[PDB]
Design a protein around this ligand. Structure first.
Ligand SMILES: NC(=[NH2+])NCCC[C@H](N)C(=O)O
Ligand SMILES: NC(=[NH2+])NCCC[C@H](N)C(=O)O
Ligand SMILES: N[C@@H](CCC(=O)O)C(=O)O
Ligand SMILES: N[C@@H](CCC(=O)O)C(=O)O
Ligand SMILES: [Cl-]
Ligand SMILES: [Cl-]
Lengths: 677, 697
């Protein structure tokens, strides 16, 4: 069964969980008045999950969650991205400025308070009652100036059930989170392209951090005098192994789902948001791939990586529409609540569904742009955020250092991808409808966008401080580069403002519709959409049947890595040390009882983007794995959980330990984790 | 699941084991030299396939891709049998196929002593004749005598076995009136043509149907309007009750070629030269050719068989190389040669180590020559059809003043031009990108000095392969049929003698013959050493328990219906269904298009009595039998010798089975006879064929 359950809903799920073999009490998982698993389950860097596993604040999350921190610490000497990183003491752990981890201190229902504040906003705009920015801004009104005021704390208020409930999360915000360990990328992201969203999977997707705190255990900014955070509760690691049918529990921070989409919303989300994305990324991939198949990657692998991650997802979603009859399932569900309302003489529900249809039909062309603009150029062309004058000198200097940084590259992406992202965007979106005429003067979108390189001072690093001697203001003000930037940004804000006339009634009607779903279903029985707050899902360890003749098992092994090895294909390179371990069968206590070395497994838990790094626990609440992905067949799970295809893809905790111990020899961390055999 | 493509004479050695796996046949039921047996119904089709006789009126089942040549030849845009299939509702509607031959084994005879006797007569031999089919055939008339060797509908085939340590003669009845009866649309006969080729799971209705015709007296015969169906003494009964995992399966047919006695150095050479070069050049050809086919239905027809054949060998080379890597095939053959060498050493025998060394030396010696041969063959001879251009003979060059011999020389040119500029040939696809793409790469791989003269000189004179090919088509009289005929109204001796396409064909042929002459210096010692090596393997293992390499003669193999584990986490079942066709359906992908009628049947579950017991509709199954190319169309029989399927492929993981059979990875891929009947019945509604086949429930 699917559902991303509120921590407050554990009491409604615990009986079913125990019938599936769970041996925890509800209070063990979430305790409003004490220590529980809620305290060990962590948000990492805004969009990932992590788990605390020691009394010294040791933190496990995915490799791909800690990737940039790993990268930032890498040079040719000390190449942690390629070779992995291992610290042998507290003092060796690496500082990560800007990295934040959050822990839920308390969850409170603020629905009534939020409502009675949301009433009569002067000129109630379109989307206040859904905006996380405006909602969390109400925290001083709810809890007084010990909100925001308190340095290591943050009050998160979000809408649930389309805004029919509001829950407040009291976060402890740690700003001293240090890098402890990482496997090499050949393990951390084995098969990163071909195997992304794929089961079977053979990826050692983990990294290790540690929460530091001040001398009395309060979350603090970085200081040389900080000590390890000593958590209330951490999760004990169980290294005894897993088998098909074992109960599994996942807690984490699922990002976004759309389980209350109506039929018309499903179709739009497909034929607009989905396929506009697939070939706009289909094109932003081949030109990107052609360009540096020929050249020596760290220049643009992180580029091709994220495009692909979202690219393949979109293909998975599209498969569910075509094969899993997603639209008709959502249509059936809304017809069921419609019939429920009709029977009760309720009129708002059909009105709600009709207004949703109306807003979707009407915003069709505007949404077309805003997503065509969002990744045709907005993330597909890097200097759409070139600096702009305040001169009306002190911070075009202090801003260009953020434009041309340690990741950014003027050098190339010129008319291989820059011209290519501009593409024939303008064919699908008439030049009538493009931002503030250039494609009409310099000829093409290439001879326009490449003309900027010579003319703009914001092309090189040399030219910036070449004429740092004086104010060429008549030249600084009229630069096409910061014109193209403010331009694409101009229409972005205008579209946000213009389509708001559709988004506002949509949100009102969705709220109305979901209220009806709420009156129909038990609120305690209905899981809300994911919204980047702490949820639990449960299931069992289980493969599936992907297609005629074929069965996928629930557990993968090191043999599967060796079957995939290909020295000539970057993604399938196998570390010589890992191969020697395989050839020697040097697995120790970490092997399966049958003698194979476990790598990944999969489960019928309901996860989504944001669950990377979530702890997977057994019937006793002990750690058995870390979530890092979902199969492409289960992508449609964001709209309707798909029990016979959807599987979370999970790192077997024994493989993580094996990598620490046998591969890296970092005994220090085994001693700290204290795995149970 | 043991390997081995057993001789018919080896049936006595295997029958006990076959029975232990559940067979309920006696040896003599399968192969009987003193009367009739299943052998009599197992047919060689078009020289390179198998077929099976299934009625008393000569009805013949084989694969779609085996009948593909004939289907293609009968197809036009107007009557597109490739695309839409073909179905005949009477004898008179069955299509005539000139040149198509089918052969039946009447007798098998050991002629080892008589061939060796004849070989010893050769004063100063090349060293190539004892494996030369041209030579071995020339011996038959002495062996069998002038009478009976001049018997019209018979052929006496002598082949080398065990590297030339045995010779067997196969007396063949040759049928030269074989008519096309039925074929499914390609969307069924070759569903997933490229992507599913060499793959399990498989969902392909790979069959076609023919009929043997004969004269007045039921004798094999050349085509005649007066011919009638041939009435075989034996035909295989068809069982439509279905199959299950674990069932015994027997396959008989004509496996073409295996290399089970390759030494490790031979494995490496085959992989790094023959296969790599095949993959490289055929990849280039296919990219251009398919593009052309998908853009024009007439081109699609013209080049359908050429493409399918090219793609088939291309992907087979990919699979063999992948097998060698993933399954350590080189290491296995090394271990096998070490075992025969240790056996030799124990017995004080020195000939074996000497043979293994002579094999390695010859392989190392011929590297440059063999790579040049493969590039020429794959790059030019197989895919540039210019290489069959006409060339003027010596009557043109030296007898032009003789009106008689001049006319003969002109007719020879015309005869060549018809063969070259055939109905399947498009000068447009040749000259636009195809010949240039191939020749450009060929020129990059083969040094100028080692290229055919015309090509070297042509590329030096004009800028490039591109400019050179463009010149050829600009200047050649054979560029088009219209230019050819305009020229032949007033022939010029010069230009005819100097024609650039002629010079290209001449130069390529000269280099081909040149390479063969020079490489014989290595190939002859290599063959002699192979003979010595296999002779030791024979001394070690004994002939009765050692299956020889395939050589396109009748063999049996047996095993059970069984899936396998291709890789970690994954298990493949033994049987595929129609649902898997529907899962693969994609209107925008040419190879996964699904016929609307087939989909209607599936949605209506209209399967008659052909369904599985669980209500699914069967499509294919796989078995642990040991097959290879040539076994396409082979009857797959159950424990009682009844037909339950037709072999048509081998799985990906099993492609390397020509080097080493691997019981945990190699599976024959088989058309379930129930799907074949379903397609004839529910899909085509060709009732008369169901009636004739008489499936047993
Ligand atoms: N591009 C990648 N392979 N990223 C790592 C895996 C991410 C995973 N598909 C989630 O989302
Ligand atoms: N090109 C093809 N798909 N041919 C049909 C299948 C032939 C099979 N791979 C044997 O050999
Ligand atoms: N890979 C996703 C997790 C997908 C899932 O668990 O469904 C992430 O980075 O958060
Ligand atoms: N497809 C092959 C048969 C391959 C096999 O059975 O191993 C052929 O056309 O003969
Ligand atoms: Cl286990
Ligand atoms: Cl499902």
């Amino acid at each position: 069964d699917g559902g991303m359950w509120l921590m407050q809903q554990i009491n409604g799920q615990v009986a079913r969980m125990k019938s599936l073999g769970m041996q925890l009490e509800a209070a063990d998982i979430y305790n409003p008045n004490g220590s529980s698993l809620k305290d060990a389950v962590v948000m990492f860097d805004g969009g990932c999950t992590g788990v605390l596993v020691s009394n010294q604040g040791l933190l496990l999350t995915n490799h791909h969650c800690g990737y940039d921190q790993i990268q930032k610490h890498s040079s040719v000497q000390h190449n942690y991205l390629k070779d992995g990183f291992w610290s042998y003491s507290l003092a060796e752990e690496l500082v990560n400025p800007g990295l934040e981890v959050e822990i839920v201190d308390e969850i409170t229902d603020v629905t009534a308070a939020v409502k009675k504040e949301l009433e009569r906003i002067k000129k109630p705009s379109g989307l206040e009652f859904l905006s996380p920015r405006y909602l969390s801004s109400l925290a001083p009104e709810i809890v007084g100036k010990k909100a925001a005021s308190r340095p290591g704390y943050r009050y998160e208020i979000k809408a649930f059930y389309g805004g029919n409930r509001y829950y407040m999360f009291t976060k402890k915000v740690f700003r001293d989170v240090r890098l402890v360990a990482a496997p090499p990328s050949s393990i951390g992201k084995f098969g990163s392209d071909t195997d992304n969203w794929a089961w079977p999977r053979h990826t050692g997707d983990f990294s290790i951090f540690r929460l530091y705190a001040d001398k009395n255990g309060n979350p603090a900014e970085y200081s040389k005098d900080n000590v390890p955070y000593r958590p209330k509760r951490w999760v004990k690691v169980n290294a005894q192994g897993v088998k098909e049918g074992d109960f599994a529990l996942i807690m984490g921070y699922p990002g976004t789902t759309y389980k209350f989409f109506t039929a018309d919303e499903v179709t739009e989300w497909s034929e607009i948001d989905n396929n506009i994305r697939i070939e706009m990324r289909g094109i932003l991939q081949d030109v990107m791939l052609r360009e540096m198949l020929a050249d020596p990657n760290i220049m643009y692998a992180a580029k091709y990586a994220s495009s692909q991650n979202g690219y393949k997802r979109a293909q998975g979603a599209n498969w569910a529409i075509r094969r899993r009859s997603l639209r008709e399932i959502k249509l059936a569900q809304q017809q069921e609540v419609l019939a429920w309302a009709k029977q009760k003489g309720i009129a708002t529900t059909e009105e709600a569904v009709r207004a949703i249809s109306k807003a979707i039909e009407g915003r069709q062309d505007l949404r077309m742009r805003q997503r065509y603009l969002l990744e045709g150029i907005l993330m597909g062309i890097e200097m759409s955020n070139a600096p702009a004058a305040d001169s009306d000198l002190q911070s075009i200097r202090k801003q260009f250092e953020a434009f041309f940084n340690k990741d950014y590259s003027p050098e190339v992406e010129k008319d291989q991808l820059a011209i290519a992202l501009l593409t024939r965007y303008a064919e699908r979106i008439p030049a009538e409808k493009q931002p503030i005429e250039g494609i009409a003067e310099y000829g093409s979108a290439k001879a326009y966008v490449e003309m900027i390189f010579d003319k703009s001072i914001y092309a090189s690093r040399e030219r910036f401080e070449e004429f740092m001697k004086n104010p060429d203001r008549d030249r600084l003000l009229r630069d096409p580069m910061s014109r193209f930037a403010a331009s694409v940004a101009y229409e972005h804000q205008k579209l946000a403002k213009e389509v708001a006339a559709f988004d506002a009634p949509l949100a009102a009607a969705q709220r109305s519709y979901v209220a009806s779903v709420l009156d129909m279903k038990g609120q305690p029985n209905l899981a809300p959409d994911a919204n980047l707050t702490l949820r639990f899902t449960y299931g069992e360890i289980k493969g599936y049947q992907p297609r005629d003749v074929v069965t996928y098992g629930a557990k993968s092994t090191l043999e599967g890595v060796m079957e995939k090895e290909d020295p000539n294909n970057w993604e399938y390179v196998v570390d010589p040390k890992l191969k020697a371990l395989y050839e020697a069968k040097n697995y120790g206590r970490y092997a399966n009882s049958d003698g194979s070395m476990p790598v990944n497994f999969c489960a019928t838990t309901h996860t989504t983007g944001g669950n990377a790094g979530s702890p997977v626990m057994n019937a006793r609440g002990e750690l058995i794995g870390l979530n890092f992905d979902r199969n492409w067949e289960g992508v449609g799970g964001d709209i309707e959980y798909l029990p016979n295809y959807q599987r979370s893809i999970i790192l077997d905790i024994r493989y993580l330990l094996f990598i620490i111990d046998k591969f890296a020899g970092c005994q220090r961390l085994i001693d700290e984790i204290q795995p149970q055999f």
